[PDB]
Structures are given as C-alpha cells and as structure tokens.
Amino acid sequence: AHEFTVYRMQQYDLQGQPYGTRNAVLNTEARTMAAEVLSRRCVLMRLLDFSYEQYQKALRQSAGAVVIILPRAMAAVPQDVVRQFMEIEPEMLAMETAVPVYFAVEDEALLSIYKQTQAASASAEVLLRTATANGFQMVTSGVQSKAVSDWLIASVEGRLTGLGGEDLPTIVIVAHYDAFGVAPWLSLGADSNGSGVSVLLELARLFSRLYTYKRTHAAYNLLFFASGGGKFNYQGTKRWLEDNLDHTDSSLLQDNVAFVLCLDTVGRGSSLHLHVSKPPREGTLQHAFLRELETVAAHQFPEVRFSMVHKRINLAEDVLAWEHERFAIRRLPAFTLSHLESHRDGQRSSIMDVRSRVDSKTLTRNTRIIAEALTRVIYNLTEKGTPPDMPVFTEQMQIQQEQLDSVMDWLTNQPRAAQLVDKDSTFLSTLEHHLSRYLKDVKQHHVKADKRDPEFVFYDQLKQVMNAYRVKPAVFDLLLAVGIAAYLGMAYVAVQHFSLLYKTV
Amino acid sequence: FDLSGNVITSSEYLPTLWVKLYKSENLDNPIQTVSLGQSLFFHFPPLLRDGENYVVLLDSTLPRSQYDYILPQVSFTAVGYHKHITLIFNPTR
Amino acid sequence: TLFHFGNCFALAYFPYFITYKCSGLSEYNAFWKCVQAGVTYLFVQLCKMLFLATFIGEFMKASVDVADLIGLNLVMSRNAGKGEYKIMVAALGWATAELIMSRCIPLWVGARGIEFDWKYIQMSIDSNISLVHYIVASAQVWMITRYDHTFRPAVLLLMFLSVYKAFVMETFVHLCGSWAALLARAVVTGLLALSTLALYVAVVN
C-alpha cells in the first residue's frame, strides 16, 4: 500500500468564476489509459505518453480522477516533450474540470503499480484473468478543497528618495515574485517573473549602491514593488495601485510618476522585447528611456535582438496580458520588459521552468543592459556625452553573478504559487530582509478577497496524500472460496481416511 | 565590501542559526554575529577590503543531543567588492 | 474485503468444527473440557510472557514450549477417559485457544477492509496445520503418560527435543519466500505428524 503525495490541479476562482479542477475527493480503482469504461475510475497517465487528445477523451468520459506520474528527474526528459508539455499547459489549465486531477512523481513502487495497472487495463482466459486480477484501488485523504477565505496576498514595497525636492519624478518598477503553473505546489517559476524580480533585487542593490552615495544620489524618486498576486490577473498590483491612488492622497504614485517598468521572464534567450500598451510619446521620459535602451542594445551589447511590442490594451481577456497594463489603466506611464515576444505564449506559468532553464550569463547580461539603460536615462547622460559604446558597470559595481545565481537557486528552492507563499512565510521574510537592506519605506500591502464579488478565492487541499490499496474483485475471492470448499470436502473425507489408516496400521 | 549571502536550509532551522564572521587570525573572538532569525539572507555591515581572511562558521543553537549536523565554514579573503556566501545547512537525525 | 474475511474464517474455524463433530464431542460434552483447556492455554501464555520478561530467541521459545507441554500434561491429568479422546480434549482446547489468540484478532482488525495481503489466508492455512501440530503435541503427552519399555524414554526424549520445531524453522527461514517458508513449515510439521502416528502404531500394544 503505497502512501504517496499527489498534487492537485489549480482550483482558483477569479471575479466569481471558477477555474481549474473543482474536486478534491477520490476513492476509485486505478484504471490507467485503456479502451475500457474508464468511468468512475482513476486514470493514470505518464508524462512520456500524455497526449492531449487522450486527456480530452478522459475528461469526456467523466473519470473519477486523473493522475499524472511526472518523471523523477524532470530534467533528463527530452526537450521536445518539454515543449509539448509547454504547449499542453495553457489549454489544459483554462477549464472548470469538476473531476480531481492529481500529479505524482515517479517512484519504483509507482512505476510498478503503473505497469500493473497498464497490464490489467489493456487486457479459460476470462477465468484466468479474473484469478490474477491484482488491480489496486486508490483513495485520497482529507476533505474537499475549501475556499481559503482569509489568505492575505502579500506585496513588498520600498521607496528610494531622490536627491532634493518634493516633486521629483518617481519611476516605479514592479515584478510579481509569484508564479502559478498547472500545479501550485510544483509551480517553482524560475524563468518566469521570479527571474525578473531577481534582476530587480540586483537593481535594488545597485541602485541602493547608487543612492547611498551623495555624488550618485540622483534626483528621481524610485518606488520598487515586489508585488504579489501576479499571474493571477495582477491582483497585487491592482490593490496596491488602488491604495496609493484613491485611498490616500500622499505617496509617490501621484507626485511625478514617470514610466513604470515591469519585469517578467526576462531571463534565458537571445532576444529582448519591450512590450507597450501604447506607443511612447516622443520627447517624454518614456521615449528618452527607450532611445537610451536602443542605443545601449545597439552599441553596448549587439548580441541581443531588441524590438518593441505595442499591444493595445484589451479589456476582454481573462488576465491583463502584461503587468504594465494595470498601470497604464490608471493613466500611469508603464511598460513591460521581457525576453519573450508574445503575451499569448504559454511560456509563463510553466512548472517546467526548472532552475536550469534560466542561464546565469543571460541573466547577468540582461541585468547589465537594463541597469545601464536606466543609469543613462536617469543621470541625463545622453545629453552629457557618454557614448553607448562603453559601459558603466565594469568594476566596483559589477553585477554579482554569484548573487544572481544564488538568489535564483533559492527562489527555485521552493514553490512560489500565490496560494502557498504565506503572508508571513520564511520566503517572504527573507525577501523582505533582502529588500530592506537596499530600500526605504519597505512595507507589505495585502489584499484579502474584497469580500464582495470575490476577485479571487484560493482553495485548499493542494498537497494531498493518496493511498494505493491492493485489492482484487469479489470473483477472485469466490474462486478462492471454491478452492477452500474443495479442501474442506477433502477434510471431511480425511477423518474417516485417517481412522481407516490407523485401523489398518 | 558590503557583504551578503543567502543560506540554504529548512525553514524551521533558520531561527536557530547565527552566521558568524570569525576572523582568520582568531577563531574564538567573533567580530560579527548576525542572527539569521527568519530571513535566509545575512547582510553583514560593509567591511573594508584588504586581505583579512575571515570565517563564516554557521553557529547554530541546535545541539548534537537531539540532531546531527555539521556547521559550515567559509573563507572569503576581502579583496573584492561583494559576496554571496551560500551556506547549505541540512542537519540529520 | 469483508467477504475475504468470511473466506478466511471459513478456512480456519470450520476444520475445528469438523474435528469437534468428528471426534465424538457428545462422548463427554467437551465444551467444559475445551474451556478448561483454553483457560490453561491462556495461563501458559501468561506464564510464557512473564518468563520472557524475566529472561536469545531459543531461550524464550524453549520456555514457551516447556510451559505449553506442562499445561497439556496437567490438563490431561485433569480428565480421564478414552486415550484418543483425552488426546482430542487437550488438542482441541489448545488449538481453539491458538485460533482465538493472535491469529483471529488480526484477521478481524485486518481483512474486511480494502487491502489484500496474502498474509491472512496464509495465517489460516498455518492455523489449520496448527491443528495437526497440537495433535502431535497431544500424542507426545499421551506417550509420556500411559505407562513406561521398548526404548520408550529414548523416543520420548527425541519427541521432546523435536518440540519448538516452529522456532527452529522460523530461524532457518530468517537466515534463508513467504509461501516457500509456509510450505517448508507445513512439510516439517507433517513429518512430525507422521513420526507421531508411527509412534502411536508402535505403542498401541
């Protein structure tokens, strides 16, 4: 009786409409992928043979549950299969499946049970098959998922005062540290915005280094925002931008707000794309920064192809595409930087985004590019000389590769889904400490559920443990009963047989 | 020097840890005892960079009587400009 | 798996009922005699647990075997009648005690559920062969009694030495499959059964 831990599919609700699987109780047999009834039976598929047509057939057959045995290494898997699992994910996720779906990890006993289930499912012959019918029944633990109603989505915010004056423009940079995949407990999210927020930390360090010294204390208020509630329609940004605009009258989100950068999945890859909701106006700070960025990317580092992406704001999509969209909604200059090119790509989320998928060299180079562009635009350097054919960050300010790698490793160390990173988890605590060492006015915004037309209601029971109980049908046991009955008849004869044998001697 | 450096360990072991800055010349007189507390990141106040071999002995409060562990030790002779010591702490028993 | 629990119970208890009805229970109405034998068996089990606490595996097994043999001898002296029938009144009581012991309670707590381990049916088989094991034990007890001649003390000492055969076979299997181990125990127990019946046909005189 194996006792493994099965991670369910997402069960979040947004704006009142549900999403993902909506069930967390199963007690059925384990009938893997076969031409049998497959109804009211747990279906076992392996990632190596998990076809979408098969999955849609499974869903149409109203299975009791679906369990996927992810490969244990999850890195030695061929990259093409990885691409297929990337391509299957957005379509798989966007549904209201009412049947629990659990994802497991390869195990010796798990492989054995999968093999046995495959043998029994696929397959004198009828009675022999009934006699050797070792088909296990899988049951889960706990109760159905309940809407966790008192989850405070966190958000870490820090400021950076300019040099002198109360009207300094306040550039704001955000990155949602969280990342949800098709499995919240498996959503490490390394190449996703967990890799843009990492660059933000180095920028935080670097800009702290830049602001710490008087001679480099630029006159530009900087509001950094390690937002929570990211791929979840950017709720953390929604609530934060709301609280600093309509609730209060203070805060820099009203003073002289310049362009608001947002960083996500800006890691691996040789192409950089700056997505915009609306084209930058020529002459403004956004346009000036874009010119600096193009000059740098054309002069400093020619190895990356760069191109703006101008996606018009769409108020029909489930999510607000990039993150700068929520900022541009509140008449605030913003744009998102990413190594990706299309928002429609299911390259985000991506539980497949293991740590080994974000190259450290690309991260250092991307950080160099962005930070140097920001430095040039902030310090009025463009109208100061400084040709873009030579960098700022050579020594004494070099982007710490070790720091970037270690931070990324730590980030990937644990799942970063918004429903599992508590508002006081050690992950958040370590992040806040790291940010506190570099920023000013660091705090933690929280969004509960709005308690009216719930913007989001996370559910629980995501890391359930499932039992593989051995069992055989009653027909086998009836056959065993017939065998023992024959033996008992023999026993009835044996008494007189032994009496006669003793008499004979 | 602006020292830094994360720590790789389980969450529950974090409050019972204090990273050290044992100077190389004397390993019995620590010069910094930043407690990790609840954050997997120590940010030792900036030091000067001139040789100065140091130690980062991870001095936990957890005794061997109920758990088995080995405290890491890192030397980072101060000649550079930053550091991201990445102590990995996985006690047993 | 309640019906499996039913099948295992049918395998274990029913042969006991068969022996009860095929051994002339009405000859003495052995319910009281069986109860006395069972009380003695429980007492012997208590004595063995106390002795094990007082006093590696061989010493405990020897103490348990000695206590069981002593209890059987006392129980046998407690009643008078047919030699085959005292054999029965001793063996049946002790065997019912063994089934009622920790070879029925696990069958209740286990089984009847969702899990299926062959252990329960194997235990029922072993309990059924325990019937003939206690038959052998009763034969040894009767041989100790029923007068003394014809190298009888040598055979009695050999039979006493052969007791605790279960522990010896268990140790061998531990040093050495479950179905294979059960089969080996079955064959050795059958060998002791045939040795005891050979002794019986030798002693009938």
Side-chain angles (χ1 to χ4, degrees), chain A residues 21-67:
Chain A
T21 172
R22 326 219 53 84
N23 236 13
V25 278
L26 62 144
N27 174 46
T28 76
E29 291 213 29
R31 309 252 68 82
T32 176
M33 295 277 256
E36 46 188 342
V37 189
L38 218 52
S39 156
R40 174 184 326 154
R41 309 272 182 76
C42 160
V43 180
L44 271 147
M45 334 170 196
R46 259 146 37 81
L47 172 144
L48 257 44
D49 53 283
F50 174 72
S51 288
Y52 208 8
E53 304 203 6
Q54 294 298 324
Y55 178 86
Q56 268 153 25
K57 160 208 198 83
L59 252 51
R60 183 185 46 246
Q61 276 273 11
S62 322
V66 163
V67 182

Short mmCIF file of all heavy atoms in Angstrom, two decimals, chain A residues 21-67:
data_model
loop_
_atom_site.label_atom_id
_atom_site.label_comp_id
_atom_site.label_asym_id
_atom_site.label_seq_id
_atom_site.Cartn_x
_atom_site.Cartn_y
_atom_site.Cartn_z
N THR A 21 -9.41 22.44 -11.70
CA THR A 21 -10.19 21.35 -11.16
C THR A 21 -11.02 21.87 -10.00
O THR A 21 -10.64 22.84 -9.34
CB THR A 21 -9.30 20.20 -10.68
OG1 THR A 21 -10.11 19.23 -10.00
CG2 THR A 21 -8.27 20.71 -9.70
N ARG A 22 -12.17 21.26 -9.78
CA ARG A 22 -13.07 21.68 -8.71
C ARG A 22 -13.54 20.49 -7.88
O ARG A 22 -14.72 20.37 -7.55
CB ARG A 22 -14.24 22.49 -9.24
CG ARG A 22 -13.85 23.34 -10.42
CD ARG A 22 -14.52 24.66 -10.35
NE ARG A 22 -14.27 25.30 -9.06
CZ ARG A 22 -13.19 26.01 -8.78
NH1 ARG A 22 -12.24 26.20 -9.68
NH2 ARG A 22 -13.07 26.57 -7.58
N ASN A 23 -12.62 19.61 -7.53
CA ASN A 23 -12.96 18.46 -6.73
C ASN A 23 -11.69 17.99 -6.04
O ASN A 23 -10.60 18.09 -6.62
CB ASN A 23 -13.53 17.34 -7.60
CG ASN A 23 -14.88 16.88 -7.16
OD1 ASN A 23 -15.53 17.53 -6.34
ND2 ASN A 23 -15.33 15.75 -7.69
N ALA A 24 -11.83 17.49 -4.82
CA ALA A 24 -10.64 17.03 -4.10
C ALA A 24 -10.89 15.75 -3.32
O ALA A 24 -10.25 15.51 -2.29
CB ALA A 24 -10.13 18.12 -3.16
N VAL A 25 -11.83 14.92 -3.77
CA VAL A 25 -12.10 13.64 -3.13
C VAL A 25 -12.16 12.57 -4.21
O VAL A 25 -12.84 12.75 -5.23
CB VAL A 25 -13.41 13.67 -2.32
CG1 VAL A 25 -13.18 14.31 -0.96
CG2 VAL A 25 -14.49 14.41 -3.10
N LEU A 26 -11.44 11.48 -4.00
CA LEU A 26 -11.49 10.36 -4.93
C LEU A 26 -11.29 9.06 -4.17
O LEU A 26 -10.44 8.97 -3.28
CB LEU A 26 -10.45 10.49 -6.04
CG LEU A 26 -8.99 10.51 -5.61
CD1 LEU A 26 -8.15 9.78 -6.63
CD2 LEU A 26 -8.51 11.94 -5.46
N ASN A 27 -12.10 8.07 -4.52
CA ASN A 27 -11.97 6.71 -3.99
C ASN A 27 -12.41 5.77 -5.11
O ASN A 27 -13.58 5.40 -5.19
CB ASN A 27 -12.80 6.52 -2.74
CG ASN A 27 -12.80 5.08 -2.26
OD1 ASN A 27 -11.75 4.45 -2.19
ND2 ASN A 27 -13.98 4.56 -1.96
N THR A 28 -11.46 5.39 -5.96
CA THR A 28 -11.83 4.53 -7.08
C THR A 28 -10.68 3.58 -7.37
O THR A 28 -9.61 3.69 -6.78
CB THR A 28 -12.13 5.31 -8.37
OG1 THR A 28 -10.90 5.76 -8.96
CG2 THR A 28 -13.05 6.51 -8.14
N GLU A 29 -10.90 2.71 -8.34
CA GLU A 29 -9.82 1.86 -8.81
C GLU A 29 -8.85 2.70 -9.63
O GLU A 29 -9.11 3.86 -9.97
CB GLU A 29 -10.36 0.72 -9.65
CG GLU A 29 -11.14 -0.32 -8.89
CD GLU A 29 -10.96 -1.70 -9.49
OE1 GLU A 29 -9.90 -1.95 -10.09
OE2 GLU A 29 -11.89 -2.53 -9.37
N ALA A 30 -7.72 2.09 -9.98
CA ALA A 30 -6.72 2.77 -10.78
C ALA A 30 -6.70 2.12 -12.16
O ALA A 30 -5.90 1.23 -12.44
CB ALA A 30 -5.37 2.70 -10.13
N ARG A 31 -7.61 2.56 -13.01
CA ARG A 31 -7.64 2.08 -14.38
C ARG A 31 -6.92 3.11 -15.24
O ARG A 31 -7.46 4.19 -15.53
CB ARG A 31 -9.07 1.82 -14.83
CG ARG A 31 -9.77 0.95 -13.82
CD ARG A 31 -9.95 -0.43 -14.38
NE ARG A 31 -8.65 -1.09 -14.51
CZ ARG A 31 -8.01 -1.70 -13.53
NH1 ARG A 31 -8.53 -1.79 -12.32
NH2 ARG A 31 -6.81 -2.23 -13.77
N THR A 32 -5.71 2.77 -15.65
CA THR A 32 -4.90 3.64 -16.47
C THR A 32 -5.45 3.64 -17.89
O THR A 32 -6.54 3.13 -18.17
CB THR A 32 -3.43 3.23 -16.42
OG1 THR A 32 -2.68 4.05 -17.32
CG2 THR A 32 -3.31 1.81 -16.82
N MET A 33 -4.69 4.21 -18.81
CA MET A 33 -5.19 4.54 -20.13
C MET A 33 -5.48 3.27 -20.91
O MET A 33 -4.54 2.59 -21.36
CB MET A 33 -4.11 5.36 -20.83
CG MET A 33 -3.84 6.68 -20.17
SD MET A 33 -4.95 8.00 -20.64
CE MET A 33 -3.82 8.84 -21.72
N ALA A 34 -6.75 2.92 -21.07
CA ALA A 34 -7.12 1.73 -21.82
C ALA A 34 -8.50 1.93 -22.45
O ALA A 34 -9.22 2.88 -22.12
CB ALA A 34 -7.11 0.48 -20.94
N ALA A 35 -8.86 1.02 -23.35
CA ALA A 35 -10.11 1.12 -24.08
C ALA A 35 -11.31 0.67 -23.25
O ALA A 35 -12.38 0.42 -23.81
CB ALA A 35 -10.04 0.32 -25.37
N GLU A 36 -11.16 0.57 -21.94
CA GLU A 36 -12.22 0.09 -21.07
C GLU A 36 -13.18 1.23 -20.76
O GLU A 36 -13.18 2.27 -21.42
CB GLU A 36 -11.63 -0.48 -19.78
CG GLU A 36 -10.58 0.43 -19.18
CD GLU A 36 -9.84 -0.20 -18.02
OE1 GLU A 36 -10.35 -1.19 -17.46
OE2 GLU A 36 -8.76 0.30 -17.66
N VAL A 37 -14.04 1.02 -19.76
CA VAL A 37 -15.07 2.01 -19.46
C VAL A 37 -14.41 3.32 -19.09
O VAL A 37 -14.81 4.40 -19.55
CB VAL A 37 -16.00 1.50 -18.34
CG1 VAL A 37 -17.19 2.43 -18.19
CG2 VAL A 37 -16.45 0.08 -18.65
N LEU A 38 -13.41 3.25 -18.22
CA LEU A 38 -12.63 4.38 -17.74
C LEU A 38 -13.49 5.40 -17.00
O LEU A 38 -13.03 6.52 -16.73
CB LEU A 38 -11.87 5.04 -18.90
CG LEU A 38 -10.47 5.55 -18.57
CD1 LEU A 38 -9.66 4.43 -17.92
CD2 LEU A 38 -9.78 6.03 -19.82
N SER A 39 -14.71 5.03 -16.66
CA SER A 39 -15.67 5.89 -15.99
C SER A 39 -15.69 5.56 -14.50
O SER A 39 -15.76 4.39 -14.12
CB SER A 39 -17.06 5.74 -16.59
OG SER A 39 -18.06 6.11 -15.65
N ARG A 40 -15.62 6.60 -13.68
CA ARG A 40 -15.59 6.48 -12.22
C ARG A 40 -14.37 5.64 -11.81
O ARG A 40 -14.40 4.84 -10.88
CB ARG A 40 -16.91 5.87 -11.72
CG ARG A 40 -17.03 5.53 -10.24
CD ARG A 40 -18.37 4.87 -9.97
NE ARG A 40 -19.42 5.39 -10.82
CZ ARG A 40 -20.51 4.71 -11.17
NH1 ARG A 40 -20.70 3.47 -10.76
NH2 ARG A 40 -21.42 5.29 -11.95
N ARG A 41 -13.28 5.82 -12.55
CA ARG A 41 -12.02 5.16 -12.25
C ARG A 41 -10.89 6.17 -12.38
O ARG A 41 -10.86 6.96 -13.32
CB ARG A 41 -11.78 3.96 -13.16
CG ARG A 41 -12.95 3.03 -13.19
CD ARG A 41 -12.81 2.01 -12.08
NE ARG A 41 -13.91 1.06 -12.09
CZ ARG A 41 -14.03 0.06 -12.95
NH1 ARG A 41 -13.10 -0.17 -13.87
NH2 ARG A 41 -15.09 -0.74 -12.89
N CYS A 42 -9.97 6.13 -11.42
CA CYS A 42 -8.80 6.98 -11.51
C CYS A 42 -8.00 6.58 -12.74
O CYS A 42 -7.78 5.39 -12.99
CB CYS A 42 -7.94 6.86 -10.26
SG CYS A 42 -6.24 7.41 -10.51
N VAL A 43 -7.58 7.57 -13.52
CA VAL A 43 -6.83 7.32 -14.75
C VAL A 43 -5.39 7.75 -14.53
O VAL A 43 -5.12 8.89 -14.14
CB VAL A 43 -7.44 8.04 -15.95
CG1 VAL A 43 -6.62 7.75 -17.20
CG2 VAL A 43 -8.88 7.62 -16.13
N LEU A 44 -4.48 6.83 -14.79
CA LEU A 44 -3.05 7.05 -14.62
C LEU A 44 -2.39 7.24 -15.97
O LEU A 44 -2.45 6.35 -16.83
CB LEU A 44 -2.42 5.86 -13.91
CG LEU A 44 -2.37 5.88 -12.39
CD1 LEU A 44 -2.50 4.46 -11.86
CD2 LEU A 44 -1.09 6.53 -11.92
N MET A 45 -1.79 8.40 -16.18
CA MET A 45 -1.01 8.64 -17.37
C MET A 45 0.37 9.13 -16.97
O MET A 45 0.54 9.80 -15.95
CB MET A 45 -1.69 9.64 -18.31
CG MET A 45 -3.20 9.68 -18.15
SD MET A 45 -3.98 11.04 -19.03
CE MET A 45 -5.59 11.10 -18.26
N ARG A 46 1.36 8.78 -17.77
CA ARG A 46 2.73 9.24 -17.59
C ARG A 46 3.04 10.36 -18.55
O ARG A 46 2.52 10.41 -19.67
CB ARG A 46 3.75 8.13 -17.78
CG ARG A 46 4.28 7.54 -16.50
CD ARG A 46 4.57 6.08 -16.68
NE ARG A 46 5.10 5.83 -18.01
CZ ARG A 46 6.37 6.02 -18.37
NH1 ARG A 46 7.27 6.44 -17.50
NH2 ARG A 46 6.73 5.78 -19.63
N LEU A 47 3.88 11.28 -18.09
CA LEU A 47 4.18 12.45 -18.91
C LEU A 47 4.76 12.03 -20.25
O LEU A 47 4.62 12.77 -21.23
CB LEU A 47 5.14 13.34 -18.13
CG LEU A 47 5.81 14.56 -18.76
CD1 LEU A 47 5.94 15.66 -17.73
CD2 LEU A 47 7.18 14.18 -19.30
N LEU A 48 5.40 10.86 -20.32
CA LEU A 48 6.01 10.43 -21.57
C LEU A 48 4.96 10.08 -22.61
O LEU A 48 5.23 10.17 -23.81
CB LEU A 48 6.90 9.22 -21.33
CG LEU A 48 8.40 9.49 -21.29
CD1 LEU A 48 8.69 10.72 -20.45
CD2 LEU A 48 9.11 8.27 -20.73
N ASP A 49 3.77 9.68 -22.17
CA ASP A 49 2.69 9.32 -23.08
C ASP A 49 1.41 10.05 -22.73
O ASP A 49 0.33 9.46 -22.69
CB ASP A 49 2.47 7.82 -23.00
CG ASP A 49 2.26 7.35 -21.58
OD1 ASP A 49 3.26 7.25 -20.84
OD2 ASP A 49 1.09 7.12 -21.19
N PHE A 50 1.50 11.34 -22.49
CA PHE A 50 0.32 12.10 -22.08
C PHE A 50 -0.14 12.93 -23.27
O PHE A 50 0.32 14.05 -23.48
CB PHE A 50 0.57 12.97 -20.86
CG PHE A 50 -0.60 13.85 -20.54
CD1 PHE A 50 -1.76 13.31 -20.02
CD2 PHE A 50 -0.55 15.21 -20.79
CE1 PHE A 50 -2.85 14.11 -19.75
CE2 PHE A 50 -1.63 16.01 -20.51
CZ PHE A 50 -2.78 15.46 -19.99
N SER A 51 -1.03 12.37 -24.06
CA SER A 51 -1.47 13.09 -25.24
C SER A 51 -2.72 13.89 -24.90
O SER A 51 -3.54 13.49 -24.07
CB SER A 51 -1.75 12.13 -26.39
OG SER A 51 -0.54 11.63 -26.92
N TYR A 52 -2.86 15.05 -25.55
CA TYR A 52 -3.97 15.93 -25.23
C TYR A 52 -5.28 15.34 -25.70
O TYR A 52 -6.31 15.51 -25.04
CB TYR A 52 -3.76 17.31 -25.83
CG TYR A 52 -4.47 18.35 -25.01
CD1 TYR A 52 -5.04 18.01 -23.78
CD2 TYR A 52 -4.57 19.66 -25.44
CE1 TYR A 52 -5.70 18.95 -23.02
CE2 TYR A 52 -5.22 20.60 -24.68
CZ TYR A 52 -5.78 20.24 -23.47
OH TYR A 52 -6.44 21.18 -22.72
N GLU A 53 -5.28 14.69 -26.86
CA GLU A 53 -6.48 14.02 -27.32
C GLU A 53 -6.89 12.98 -26.30
O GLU A 53 -8.07 12.82 -25.99
CB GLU A 53 -6.23 13.40 -28.69
CG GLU A 53 -5.76 14.42 -29.71
CD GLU A 53 -6.02 13.99 -31.14
OE1 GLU A 53 -6.67 12.94 -31.34
OE2 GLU A 53 -5.58 14.70 -32.06
N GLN A 54 -5.90 12.29 -25.73
CA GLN A 54 -6.16 11.30 -24.71
C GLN A 54 -6.77 11.96 -23.49
O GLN A 54 -7.73 11.45 -22.90
CB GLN A 54 -4.86 10.61 -24.33
CG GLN A 54 -4.22 9.77 -25.41
CD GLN A 54 -5.10 8.63 -25.84
OE1 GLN A 54 -5.80 8.03 -25.03
NE2 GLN A 54 -5.06 8.30 -27.13
N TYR A 55 -6.22 13.11 -23.10
CA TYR A 55 -6.73 13.81 -21.93
C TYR A 55 -8.15 14.30 -22.14
O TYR A 55 -8.99 14.23 -21.23
CB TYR A 55 -5.81 14.97 -21.60
CG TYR A 55 -6.30 15.75 -20.42
CD1 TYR A 55 -5.98 15.38 -19.13
CD2 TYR A 55 -7.09 16.88 -20.61
CE1 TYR A 55 -6.44 16.10 -18.06
CE2 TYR A 55 -7.54 17.60 -19.55
CZ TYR A 55 -7.22 17.21 -18.27
OH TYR A 55 -7.68 17.95 -17.21
N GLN A 56 -8.44 14.82 -23.33
CA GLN A 56 -9.78 15.29 -23.62
C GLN A 56 -10.77 14.13 -23.68
O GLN A 56 -11.92 14.28 -23.25
CB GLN A 56 -9.74 16.04 -24.94
CG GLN A 56 -9.50 17.52 -24.76
CD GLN A 56 -8.83 18.14 -25.97
OE1 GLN A 56 -8.95 17.63 -27.09
NE2 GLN A 56 -8.11 19.23 -25.76
N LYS A 57 -10.32 12.98 -24.17
CA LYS A 57 -11.16 11.79 -24.13
C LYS A 57 -11.42 11.39 -22.69
O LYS A 57 -12.54 11.01 -22.33
CB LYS A 57 -10.48 10.66 -24.89
CG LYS A 57 -10.98 9.29 -24.53
CD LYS A 57 -9.90 8.24 -24.75
CE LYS A 57 -10.49 6.85 -24.81
NZ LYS A 57 -11.01 6.53 -26.17
N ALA A 58 -10.39 11.49 -21.85
CA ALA A 58 -10.51 11.16 -20.44
C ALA A 58 -11.54 12.06 -19.78
O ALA A 58 -12.41 11.59 -19.03
CB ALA A 58 -9.15 11.30 -19.76
N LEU A 59 -11.47 13.35 -20.08
CA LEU A 59 -12.39 14.28 -19.45
C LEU A 59 -13.80 14.01 -19.95
O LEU A 59 -14.76 14.08 -19.18
CB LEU A 59 -11.99 15.72 -19.76
CG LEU A 59 -11.40 16.46 -18.57
CD1 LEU A 59 -10.30 15.62 -17.93
CD2 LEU A 59 -10.90 17.82 -18.99
N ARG A 60 -13.93 13.70 -21.23
CA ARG A 60 -15.25 13.46 -21.78
C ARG A 60 -15.84 12.19 -21.19
O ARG A 60 -17.07 12.06 -21.10
CB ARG A 60 -15.17 13.31 -23.29
CG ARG A 60 -16.51 13.13 -23.97
CD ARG A 60 -16.33 12.88 -25.44
NE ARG A 60 -15.29 11.88 -25.67
CZ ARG A 60 -14.13 12.11 -26.27
NH1 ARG A 60 -13.81 13.31 -26.72
NH2 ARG A 60 -13.27 11.11 -26.44
N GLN A 61 -14.99 11.25 -20.77
CA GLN A 61 -15.51 10.02 -20.20
C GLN A 61 -15.90 10.14 -18.73
O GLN A 61 -16.34 9.15 -18.16
CB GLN A 61 -14.46 8.92 -20.34
CG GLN A 61 -14.48 8.23 -21.68
CD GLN A 61 -15.45 7.07 -21.70
OE1 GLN A 61 -16.26 6.92 -20.78
NE2 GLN A 61 -15.37 6.25 -22.73
N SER A 62 -15.73 11.31 -18.11
CA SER A 62 -16.12 11.53 -16.72
C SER A 62 -15.37 10.56 -15.80
O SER A 62 -15.97 9.74 -15.09
CB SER A 62 -17.64 11.41 -16.55
OG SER A 62 -18.30 11.99 -17.66
N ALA A 63 -14.05 10.65 -15.82
CA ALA A 63 -13.24 9.82 -14.94
C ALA A 63 -13.36 10.26 -13.48
O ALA A 63 -13.69 11.42 -13.18
CB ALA A 63 -11.78 9.84 -15.37
N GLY A 64 -13.11 9.32 -12.57
CA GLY A 64 -13.12 9.66 -11.16
C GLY A 64 -12.02 10.65 -10.81
O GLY A 64 -12.24 11.60 -10.05
N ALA A 65 -10.83 10.45 -11.37
CA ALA A 65 -9.70 11.35 -11.18
C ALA A 65 -8.65 11.04 -12.24
O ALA A 65 -8.66 9.96 -12.85
CB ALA A 65 -9.11 11.24 -9.78
N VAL A 66 -7.74 11.98 -12.43
CA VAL A 66 -6.63 11.82 -13.36
C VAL A 66 -5.33 12.03 -12.62
O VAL A 66 -5.14 13.08 -11.98
CB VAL A 66 -6.73 12.80 -14.54
CG1 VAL A 66 -5.40 12.90 -15.24
CG2 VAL A 66 -7.82 12.35 -15.50
N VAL A 67 -4.44 11.05 -12.68
CA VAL A 67 -3.16 11.15 -12.01
C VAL A 67 -2.05 11.05 -13.05
O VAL A 67 -2.05 10.13 -13.87
CB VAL A 67 -2.99 10.09 -10.92
CG1 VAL A 67 -1.66 10.28 -10.22
CG2 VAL A 67 -4.13 10.19 -9.93
#
